[PDB]
Structures are given as structure tokens and as C-alpha cells.
């Protein structure tokens, strides 16, 4: 574990990340897809091996030594607010397990369901609160990447309410 297990934001692209593995928000189908999913395709196309896996779950493959996190969360377009909410928590529990597994002392994170598949809502405040419920029990030390600069704000007030 981090000797002090602690939550950061960076405004930035999480292909440059500087933690010891990164979550993917990854389609269902291990497609290159759009926007996080794209960048990661770009950076670590070996991790694209055998990555398909349902919504609410999460897949690792490495690429080298370097673990990629394929966390599948639902797209509020085609899901109920209420199963959507279900499969978004139930993807961050799994990132957890994973995160755990893979004894890493730190993890790149985005916030999952928050771009192409938000179905067009403000999903800030529901996304980083599962990711809080699943993550709070692991000692790695969490980078959330984001790219909106209002977003970084309410990301690191929200992440200080805490401390
Ligand atoms: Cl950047
Ligand atoms: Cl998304
Ligand atoms: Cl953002």
C-alpha cells in the first residue's frame, strides 16, 4: 500500500499519468472507441487483447508490466437512471477488487459515465461518489484525471470536504 493512502485530481490526459496503472473507461466490446477509451487506445493497444466484458464489470490486461484497469461502466443513453445507477456502482467495486488484486500502490482513474456515456446529464457528484464507496477500503494512493476545468474545482472541494 501508499504510506498514506490519499485522493488527487489532474486536469490532463490520463495517458501521461504517472501512477503505477490506469483504469480504462472502456465499451463493453474491447473497441478503440471515443474520448478516455480513445487516448488509452493509443497509448496501450496491446491492452486491447481480449478486453470485451459486460457493463458493471471490469477486465485487466497487461501491456508489458503495466496493468490496464478495462472498467465498463453503463450508458445512461440505453439504461434507466435507476439499473444505470446500479451498474456504475457495481464497475467501481470491480476496479477496486482489481486494484487490490494487482498489489499497485497507486491507480490513474476517470470518472466513468461522465462523457459520451452521461446521456447528456451532469453526472459529476453520482460518479465520484461510487468511485468513493468502492475505493475508500483500498490503501492505494488515487489520481482522478479529468479535462474540464470547472470539473477540477468541484472534483478537489469535494475531495477536501473529506480531509
Ligand atoms: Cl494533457
Ligand atoms: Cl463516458
Ligand atoms: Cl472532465
Known amino acids: 500500500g501508499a504510506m498514506a493512502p490519499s485522493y488527487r485530481v ?7 499519468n504517472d501512477e503505477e496503472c490506469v483504469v480504462n473507461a472502456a465499451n463493453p466490446r474491447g473497441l ?3 474520448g478516455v477509451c480513445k487516448a488509452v487506445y493509443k497509448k496501450w493497444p496491446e491492452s486491447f487483447k481480449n478486453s470485451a466484458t459486460p457493463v458493471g464489470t471490469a477486465k485487466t490486461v ?4 503495466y496493468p490496464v484497469i ?27 477488487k482489481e486494484v487490490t488484486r494487482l498489489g499497485v500502490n497507486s491507480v490513474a482513474i476517470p470518472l466513468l459515465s461522465t462523457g459520451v456515456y452521461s446521456g447528456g446529464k451532469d453526472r459529476l457528484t453520482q ?13 492505494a494512493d488515487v489520481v482522478i484525471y479529468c479535462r474540464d476545468k470547472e470539473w477540477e474545482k468541484k472534483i478537489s472541494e469535494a475531495i477536501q470536504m473529506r480531509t
Open 10 to 16: 489532474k486536469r490532463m490526459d490520463i495517458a501521461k
Open 32 to 34: 478503440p472507441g471515443d
Open 62 to 65: 497487461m501491456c508489458g508490466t
Open 70 to 96: 478495462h472498467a465498463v461502466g453503463p450508458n445512461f443513453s440505453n439504461y434507466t437512471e435507476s439499473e444505470g445507477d446500479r451498474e456504475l456502482a457495481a464497475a467501481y467495486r470491480e476496479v477496486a
Open 127 to 139: 460518479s465520484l461518489n461510487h468511485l468513493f464507496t468502492a475505493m475508500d477500503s483500498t490503501d
